[PDB]
Amino acid sequence: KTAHSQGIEGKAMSEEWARYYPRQFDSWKKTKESDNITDMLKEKPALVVAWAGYPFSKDYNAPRGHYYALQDNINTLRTGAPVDGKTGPLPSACWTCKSPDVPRIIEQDGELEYFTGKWAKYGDEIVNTIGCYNCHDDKSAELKSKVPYLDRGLSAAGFKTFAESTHQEKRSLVCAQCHVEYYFKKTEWKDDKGVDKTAMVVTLPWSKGISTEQMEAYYDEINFADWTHGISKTPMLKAQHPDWELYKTGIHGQKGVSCADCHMPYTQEGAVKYSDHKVGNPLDNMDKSCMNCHRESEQKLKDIVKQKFERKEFLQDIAFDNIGKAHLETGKAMELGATDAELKEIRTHIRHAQWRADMAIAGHGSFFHAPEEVLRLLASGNEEAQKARIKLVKVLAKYGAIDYVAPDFETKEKAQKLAKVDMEAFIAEKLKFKQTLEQEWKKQAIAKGRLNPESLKGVDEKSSYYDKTKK
Amino acid sequence: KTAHSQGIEGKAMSEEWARYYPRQFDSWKKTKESDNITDMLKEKPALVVAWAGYPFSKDYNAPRGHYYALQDNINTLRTGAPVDGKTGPLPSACWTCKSPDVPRIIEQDGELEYFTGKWAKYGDEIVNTIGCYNCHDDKSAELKSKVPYLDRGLSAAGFKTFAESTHQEKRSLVCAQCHVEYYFKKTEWKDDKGVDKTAMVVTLPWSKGISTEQMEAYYDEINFADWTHGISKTPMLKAQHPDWELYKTGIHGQKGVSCADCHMPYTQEGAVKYSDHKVGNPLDNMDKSCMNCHRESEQKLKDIVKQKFERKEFLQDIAFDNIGKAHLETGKAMELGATDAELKEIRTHIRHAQWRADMAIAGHGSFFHAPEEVLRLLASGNEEAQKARIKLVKVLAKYGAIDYVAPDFETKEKAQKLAKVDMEAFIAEKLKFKQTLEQEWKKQAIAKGRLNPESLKGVDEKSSYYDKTKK
Numbered sequence: 001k002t003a004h005s006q007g008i009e010g011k012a013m014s015e016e017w018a019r020y021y022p023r024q025f026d027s028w029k030k031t032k033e034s035d036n037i038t039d040m041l042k043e044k045p046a047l048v049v050a051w052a053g054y055p056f057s058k059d060y061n062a063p064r065g066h067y068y069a070l071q072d073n074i075n076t077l078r079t080g081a082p083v084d085g086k087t088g089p090l091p092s093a094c095w096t097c098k099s100p101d102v103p104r105i106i107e108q109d110g111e112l113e114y115f116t117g118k119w120a121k122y123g124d125e126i127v128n129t130i131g132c133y134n135c136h137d138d139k140s141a142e143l144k145s146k147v148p149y150l151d152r153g154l155s156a157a158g159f160k161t162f163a164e165s166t167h168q169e170k171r172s173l174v175c176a177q178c179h180v181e182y183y184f185k186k187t188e189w190k191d192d193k194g195v196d197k198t199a200m201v202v203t204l205p206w207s208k209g210i211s212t213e214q215m216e217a218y219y220d221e222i223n224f225a226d227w228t229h230g231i232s233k234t235p236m237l238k239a240q241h242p243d244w245e246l247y248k249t250g251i252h253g254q255k256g257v258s259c260a261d262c263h264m265p266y267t268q269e270g271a272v273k274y275s276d277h278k279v280g281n282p283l284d285n286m287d288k289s290c291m292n293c294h295r296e297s298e299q300k301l302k303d304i305v306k307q308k309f310e311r312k313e314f315l316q317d318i319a320f321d322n323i324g325k326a327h328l329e330t331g332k333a334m335e336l337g338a339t340d341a342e343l344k345e346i347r348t349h350i351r352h353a354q355w356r357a358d359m360a361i362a363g364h365g366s367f368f369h370a371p372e373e374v375l376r377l378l379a380s381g382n383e384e385a386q387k388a389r390i391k392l393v394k395v396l397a398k399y400g401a402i403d404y405v406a407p408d409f410e411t412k413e414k415a416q417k418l419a420k421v422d423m424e425a426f427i428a429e430k431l432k433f434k435q436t437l438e439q440e441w442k443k444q445a446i447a448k449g450r451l452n453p454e455s456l457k458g459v460d461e462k463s464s465y466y467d468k469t470k471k
Numbered sequence: 472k473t474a475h476s477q478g479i480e481g482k483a484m485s486e487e488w489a490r491y492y493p494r495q496f497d498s499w500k501k502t503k504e505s506d507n508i509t510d511m512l513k514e515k516p517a518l519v520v521a522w523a524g525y526p527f528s529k530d531y532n533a534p535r536g537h538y539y540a541l542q543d544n545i546n547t548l549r550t551g552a553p554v555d556g557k558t559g560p561l562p563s564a565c566w567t568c569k570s571p572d573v574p575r576i577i578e579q580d581g582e583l584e585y586f587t588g589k590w591a592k593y594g595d596e597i598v599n600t601i602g603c604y605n606c607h608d609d610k611s612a613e614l615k616s617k618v619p620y621l622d623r624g625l626s627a628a629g630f631k632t633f634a635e636s637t638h639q640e641k642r643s644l645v646c647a648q649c650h651v652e653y654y655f656k657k658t659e660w661k662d663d664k665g666v667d668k669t670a671m672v673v674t675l676p677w678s679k680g681i682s683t684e685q686m687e688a689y690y691d692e693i694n695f696a697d698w699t700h701g702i703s704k705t706p707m708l709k710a711q712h713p714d715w716e717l718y719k720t721g722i723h724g725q726k727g728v729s730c731a732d733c734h735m736p737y738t739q740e741g742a743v744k745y746s747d748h749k750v751g752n753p754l755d756n757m758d759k760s761c762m763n764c765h766r767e768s769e770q771k772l773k774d775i776v777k778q779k780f781e782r783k784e785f786l787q788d789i790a791f792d793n794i795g796k797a798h799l800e801t802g803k804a805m806e807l808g809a810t811d812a813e814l815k816e817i818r819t820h821i822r823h824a825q826w827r828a829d830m831a832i833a834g835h836g837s838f839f840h841a842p843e844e845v846l847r848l849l850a851s852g853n854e855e856a857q858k859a860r861i862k863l864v865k866v867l868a869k870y871g872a873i874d875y876v877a878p879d880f881e882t883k884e885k886a887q888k889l890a891k892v893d894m895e896a897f898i899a900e901k902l903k904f905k906q907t908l909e910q911e912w913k914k915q916a917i918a919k920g921r922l923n924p925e926s927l928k929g930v931d932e933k934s935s936y937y938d939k940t941k942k
C-alpha cells in the first residue's frame with residue numbers, strides 16, 4: 001500500500017502529491033523549461049488557407065511543456081474573448097485534456113454536465129495544468145485513465161480497455177487520454193431535474209479502426225464536417241494530434257515500445273527505479289531515451305531523425321500547396337457562377353486530401369513515430385488535391401477563366417488576408433479578456449483554494465501575439 | 472596463401488574453382504532453385520506505356536537466380552534476333568554484368584574493344600553466367616571488382632575506390648559492379664592498328680552524387696536521353712536497378728550492414744566460417760539473414776516487410792497511372808497540332824516524373840533497402856506528373872479537346888497496343904534466332920572449351936514467352 005491509501009485531499013493540485021513523491025514532482029515541474037512558442041501559421045502559412053473559416057486560421061502553435069497546457073488553452077486566440085460564463089466561441093470540452101480539474105469536475109457533476117455549456121463556464125474551476133491526477137490513482141498511485149471516452153474508443157476499435165491492458169500498454173494509454181484525434185458529438189440529454197440540455201462530447205472516431213482511412217470512412221458515413229471552408233465551402237474535417245493512433249502503426253509501436261520509454265525514461269539507483277517526469281524531447285536525453293536499445297553515436301541517430309523530418313517537410317509543403325490552390329481555385333469558380341453540383345466531386349477530393357494531409361502532420365512527432373505512414377499519407381493527400389485541381393481547370397474553363405492563377409500565400413499575413421482573418425481585432429479583444437475576466441478567474445480560483453499562485457510563475461509570459469521575453 | 476596461388480586455368484568457368492572450394496561452389500550453384508519468371512509488364516502494364524518506344528515495352532521480368540543471368544540476357548526480347556555478329560538492336564555492353572567471361576575478354580582485348588560492336592559480337596565467347604571470377608581474385612581468392620567503371624564512378628562521387636575500401640565495404644561493392652544504375656556513353660577511339668572505332672561504354676552517372684536528384688542533374692546537364700518516347704516524344708531517362716545507390720541511403724546501409732550480410736549470411740562450424748553463396752531472398756533464411764541482429768518472431772518481421780511492399784505498391788500505381796496518362800495526353804495534343812514549344816515544359820515534367828518513379832521501383836529490393844526514400848521518390852515523381860497533367864488540360868483545351876479521356880492500359884495487351892508493340896512478330900523472330908544462331912553459339916563455345924554443357928541444365932526452360940514447365 002501507499003502512504004496515502006485513503007486518498008489525497010486536494011488531489012487535483014499536483015503540489016498535494018509532493019509530500020509523498022518529491023522526486024517525480026520535481027521532474028514533473030521541469031516541463032516549465034520547454035517554454036518555446038513556435039507559431040505554426042508563421043512557419044507554414046499554407047495552413048491558414050487550409051483552415052480558412054475555422055479557428056485554427058487565427059492561432060495555432062507547436063506543442064510545448066505540459067506546464068503551459070492550461071495557460072495556452074486560455075491564451076490561444078481560438079478560445080476567443082468571453083465576457084462571462086455564457087459567452088465565447090468554444091465549448092466546455094476544450095478543457096478536457098488540459099487539467100486534472102477535469103476528472104475532478106466529471107466525478108462531481110457527471111460527464112454530460114461537464115460537456116454542457118461554454119468553455120468560459122469553468123474558467124474559475126479548471127485552473128491546474130496537466131497533473132499527477134490526470135494519470136494516477138490518488139489511493140494506489142497506479143496508472144489510470146480518468147476519461148471515459150478513451151475506453152469507449154478502445155472498445156469500438158476492438159482494443160482492450162485500459163483496465164484489461166498490460167502494464168506496458170498502460171504506459172502509452174495514459175498518454176492516449178489526450179494525445180489522440182477526436183471530434184465533438186452533439187448529444188441531447190436531460191438532467192436529474194428533468195431539464196433538457198445539449199452537450200458536446202469528446203468522441204474518438206475509432207469505431208471503424210484507427211487508420212486514417214478508417215476514420216475518414218467513419219466521418220463520411222455520418223456526413224460529418226468540422227466546418228464549411230471559408231473559401232471553397234467544402235465540408236471539412238479537422239485532424240487534431242493523432243499521436244497515439246499513428247504511433248500504434250509505427251515500428252516502435254508494433255514492437256511494444258511505449259510513449260513512456262522514450263518520453264519518460266527510467267533511471268536506476270540501486271533497487272529503486274525512477275521515471276523522468278519531465279515530458280519533453282527524447283533527443284535532449286538520448287542516453288536514457290534511446291541508447292538503452294540502440295548501440296551507436298547519439299549524433300548519427302539524431303542525424304537520422306533529422307533526415308526523416310526533412311523528407312516529411314518536403315512532402316508536406318507540396319501537399320498543402322496544392323490543397324491551398326484547390327481551395328482558392330474552387331472559390332474562384334464559385335465567384336464565376338459554378339454550381340454546387342459542378343463542384344461536388346471536387347469538394348469531396350479536397351475534403352479527403354486535407355483530412356489525410358492534416359492527419360499526417362497534426363501529430364508533431366509522427367514523422368518519427370511512423371515515418372513511412374506519414375510519407376504515404378502526404379502522398380495520398382497530395383494526389384487527392386491534384387485530382388481536384390485537374391477537374392477544377394475544366395470548371396474554370398467552362399466559366400472562361402482557364403488561365404486563372406491562384407493567389408500566393410507564402411506569408412502568414414498574405415494567407416490570413418485571403419482567409420479574411422482580422423488578427424488585430426481578435427488580438428485586441430483577447431487582451432481585454434485576459435486583463436479582465438481571466439484575472440478574475442484566477443483571483444477567484446485562488447480565493448476558493450482551487451489554485452496555488454506558485455503554479456503561475458512564468459506561465460504567462462509568451463503566446464503567439466506577445467512575449468514578455470523569457471518564461 | 473591459397474592452393475592456387477599461381478592462378479586458375481579456365482578461371483572464367485566457375486566449375487574450375489570447385490576443386491578448391493567445393494562448399495561455396497555447391498551453394499553458388501543453388502541459385503538454380505530461383506527459376507521463377509515474373510512478367511513485370513503483365514503485373515504492371517502501366518510500365519509498357521511508360522516505356523513506349525523503348526525495348527522495355529517488349530519484355531521486362533523480375534530478377535531471378537544468378538544461374539539464369541546469361542540465359543535471360545539471351546532470352547529477353549530486348550536483345551532481339553541477330554543473324555550474325557554485326558546485327559541485333561543492342562551493343563556488346565549488354566553482356567557486362569552477366570558473365571565472368573566479361574573480365575576475361577576485357578583483360579584480353581582491352582576495355583574499349585570489348586565495348587565496341589554489337590551484343591551478337593560475343594555470342595560464342597561470353598557463355599558462362601555470374602561466376603566466382605566476377606567477384607574473386609583467382610590467385611588469392613580475395614574479393615575484387617573486375618570492372619573499371621565502378622572505381623571510376625566511386626571516385627567521381629567522392630567515395631573511396633574498391634582497393635581503398637574496408638573489407639565490410641567490399642562485401643557490398645562486389646555487388647555494386649552490377650547492381651547499380653548506368654548509361655552507355657558513346658566513346659570515340661582509335662585502336663593499335665590506327666582504325667577509328669566507336670564504343671558504347673558502361674558509365675555510372677555518379678559525378679554529382681548518387682541521389683536520384685543528383686543523377687537527374689547529371690543527365691540534364693549533358694542533355695542526355697535514353698530514348699524519345701514513342702507516344703509523347705519526351706526526352707526520356709531509363710533507370711536500371713539502382714540497388715546499391717538506394718541501399719547506401721537506407722538505414723541498413725548507413726549502419727554498415729552489407730549486401731552480403733543479408734544475401735550471403737555466414738554459417739559458423741567450429742573455427743571455420745562459410746558464406747552462403749546461394750544469393751536469393753533473405754526472407755527464406757531469416758534465422759541466418761536477419762535474426763542475427765534482430766530479436767523477435769520471423770513472422771512479425773516478415774509482416775513488416777510485407778507492409779512496406781504494400782505501401783510502395785500503393786504509391787507506385789498512382790505515380791505510373793498519372794505518368795501513363797500524361798504520356799497519352801501529350802500524344803493527343805501532338806495529334807491536334809500542339810507545337811514542341813507548347814509542350815516543352817510538360818515534357819520536362821514527364822521526364823523528371825518518370826525518372827524519379829523509375830528510380831524508385833527499378834531496384835526491386837529498394838522498398839525494403841530504403842523504404843522512406845522510395846516513398847518520397849514515388850510521391851515526388853507523381854507530383855511532377857500531375858504538374859504536367861494540369862498544364863496538359865490547358866493545351867488540350869486550346870485545341871478543343873478539354874474533355875479528352877486518356878485510353879486505359881490496365882492489361883499488358885491493351886498497353887502494348889497503345890505502345891505499338893507487335894509482340895507476335897518479335898517473339899516469332901526471337902524463336903528463330905534461338906533455334907539457329909543461339910544453338911550455334913553454344914555448340915561452338917562447347918567445341919572451343921569455353922562452355923561446359925553441365926552449366927546448361929534446366930537453364931532455358933522458361934522466359935516470358937514460353938514455359939517448358941519447370942527448371
Ligand code: HEC
Pocket residue numbers: 034062063064065066067068069070072073096097098099130134135171174175176177178179259260263264279280281
Ligand atoms: C492530457 C491530460 C494529456 C496527457 C495525459 C498527456 N499529455 Fe502531453 N500534452 C498535452 C497538452 C495539452 C500538451 C500541449 C502543451 C502546451 O501548452 O503546448 C502536451 C504536450 C506534450 C509534449 C510536447 C512537450 C514539448 O516540450 O514540446 C509531449 C512530448 C507530450 N505532451 C507527451 C506526452 C506523453 C508521452 C504522455 C504520456 C506519458 C502525455 N503527453 C500525456 C496533454 C496531455
Ligand code: HEC
Pocket residue numbers: 059060061062063072073076078079090093094095096097177178179180182202240241362363364
Ligand atoms: C484531448 C482529447 C484534447 C482535446 C479534446 C483538445 N485538446 Fe488541445 N491539445 C491536446 C494535446 C495532446 C495537445 C498537444 C499536441 C499538439 O499537437 O498540439 C493540445 C494542444 C493544445 C494547444 C497548444 C497548441 C496550439 O494549438 O496552439 C492549445 C492552444 C489547445 N490544445 C487548445 C484546445 C482547444 C481550444 C480545444 C477545444 C476545441 C482543445 N484544445 C481540445 C489535446 C486535446
Ligand code: HEC
Pocket residue numbers: 014017018021024025028130131132133134135136141143170171174175260264273274275276277
Ligand atoms: C501522465 C501523463 C503522468 C503524469 C502527469 C504524472 N505521471 Fe507519474 N508516471 C507516469 C508513468 C507513465 C509512469 C511510469 C509507470 C511505470 O510503472 O513504468 C509514472 C510513474 C510514477 C511513479 C512510480 C515510480 C516511477 O516510475 O518514478 C510515481 C510515484 C509517480 N509517477 C508519481 C507522479 C506524481 C507525484 C506526479 C505529479 C507531480 C505524476 N506522477 C504525474 C505518468 C504520469
Ligand code: HEC
Pocket residue numbers: 251252255257261262282283286289290291292293294301302304305368371722765766
Ligand atoms: C527500446 C525499447 C527502444 C527504444 C527506447 C527506442 N527504440 Fe528505436 N527501435 C527499437 C526497435 C525494436 C526498433 C525496430 C527495428 C529493430 O531494430 O529491431 C527500433 C527502430 C528504430 C529506428 C528504425 C525505424 C525507422 O523509423 O526507420 C530508428 C531510426 C530508431 N529506432 C531510433 C530511435 C531513437 C532516436 C530513439 C530514442 C528517442 C529510439 N529509437 C528509442 C527499440 C527502441
Ligand code: HEC
Pocket residue numbers: 062063064172175176179243244245247248252253257258259260261262263281282283305363364365366368369
Ligand atoms: C521513442 C521511440 C518514442 C516513442 C515510443 C514515442 N515518441 Fe514521441 N517523440 C519521439 C521523438 C524522437 C520525437 C521527435 C523529437 C524531435 O524534436 O525531433 C517525438 C515527438 C513527439 C511529439 C511532438 C512534440 C513537439 O513537437 O513539441 C509528441 C507530442 C510526442 N512525441 C508524443 C508521444 C506520445 C503520446 C507517444 C505515444 C503514443 C510517443 N510520443 C511515443 C520519440 C518517441
Ligand code: HEC
Pocket residue numbers: 505533534535536537538539540541543544567568569570601605606642645646647648649650730731734735750751752
Ligand atoms: C554482375 C556480374 C552481378 C554481380 C557481381 C552480382 N549480381 Fe546479383 N544479379 C545480377 C543479374 C544479371 C541478376 C539477374 C538474374 C536473372 O537472370 O534474372 C541478378 C540477380 C540477383 C538477385 C535476385 C535473385 C532472385 O532469386 O530473384 C539478387 C538478390 C542479387 N542478384 C543480389 C546480389 C548481391 C547481394 C550481390 C553481391 C554479393 C550480387 N547480386 C552480385 C548480376 C550481378
Ligand code: HEC
Pocket residue numbers: 530531532533534543544547549550561564565566567568648649650651653673711712833834835
Ligand atoms: C550492370 C551494370 C548491368 C548492365 C550494363 C546491364 N544489366 Fe541487365 N541486369 C543487371 C542486374 C543487376 C540485373 C538484376 C536486377 C534487376 O532489377 O533486373 C539485371 C537483369 C537483367 C535481365 C533480367 C531481368 C529483365 O529485365 O528481364 C535481363 C534480361 C537483362 N538484365 C538484360 C540486359 C541487357 C539487354 C542489357 C543491355 C542494355 C543489360 N542487361 C545491361 C545488371 C546490368
Ligand code: HEC
Pocket residue numbers: 485488489492495496499601602603604605606607612614641642645646731735744745746747748
Ligand atoms: C560475387 C557476387 C560472388 C560470387 C559470384 C562468388 N563469391 Fe565467393 N564470396 C563473396 C563474398 C561477398 C564473400 C564473403 C567475403 C567475406 O570475407 O565476408 C565470399 C566468400 C568466399 C570465400 C571465403 C569463405 C566464405 O566466406 O565462404 C570463398 C572461398 C569463396 N567466396 C569462393 C567462391 C567460389 C568458389 C565461387 C564460385 C563458385 C564464388 N565464391 C562466387 C562473393 C562472391
Ligand code: HEC
Pocket residue numbers: 251294295722723726728732733753754757760761762763764765772773775776839842
Ligand atoms: C545486422 C548486421 C543486421 C542485419 C543482418 C539485418 N538488420 Fe535490420 N537493422 C539493423 C540495424 C542496426 C537497424 C537500424 C535500426 C536499429 O535497430 O538500430 C535495422 C533496422 C531494421 C528495420 C527498421 C528500419 C526500417 O526499414 O523501417 C527493419 C524492419 C529491419 N531492420 C529488418 C530486417 C530484416 C527483415 C533483415 C533480414 C532480411 C534485417 N533487418 C537484417 C541491423 C541488421
Ligand code: HEC
Pocket residue numbers: 533534535643646647650714715716718719723724728729730731732733734752753754776834835836837839840
Ligand atoms: C538486409 C538488411 C539486406 C541488405 C543489407 C540488402 N538486402 Fe537486398 N533484399 C533484402 C530483402 C528483405 C529483400 C526483399 C525480399 C522480399 O522478397 O521481400 C531484398 C531484395 C533485393 C533484391 C530484389 C530481388 C528480387 O526481387 O528478385 C535485390 C536485387 C537485392 N535485394 C540486392 C541487394 C544488394 C545488391 C544489396 C546491397 C547493395 C542488398 N540487396 C542489401 C535484404 C537486404
Ligand SMILES: [Ca+2]
Pocket residue numbers: 181182183237238239240
Ligand atoms: Ca478532429
Ligand SMILES: [Ca+2]
Pocket residue numbers: 652653654708709710711
Ligand atoms: Ca540508366
Ligand SMILES: [Y+2]
Pocket residue numbers: 009016
Ligand atoms: Y496535503
Ligand SMILES: [Y+2]
Pocket residue numbers: 034062063064065
Ligand atoms: Y515542442
Ligand SMILES: [Y+2]
Pocket residue numbers: 371372842843
Ligand atoms: Y523506416
Ligand SMILES: [Y+2]
Pocket residue numbers: 480487
Ligand atoms: Y582445373
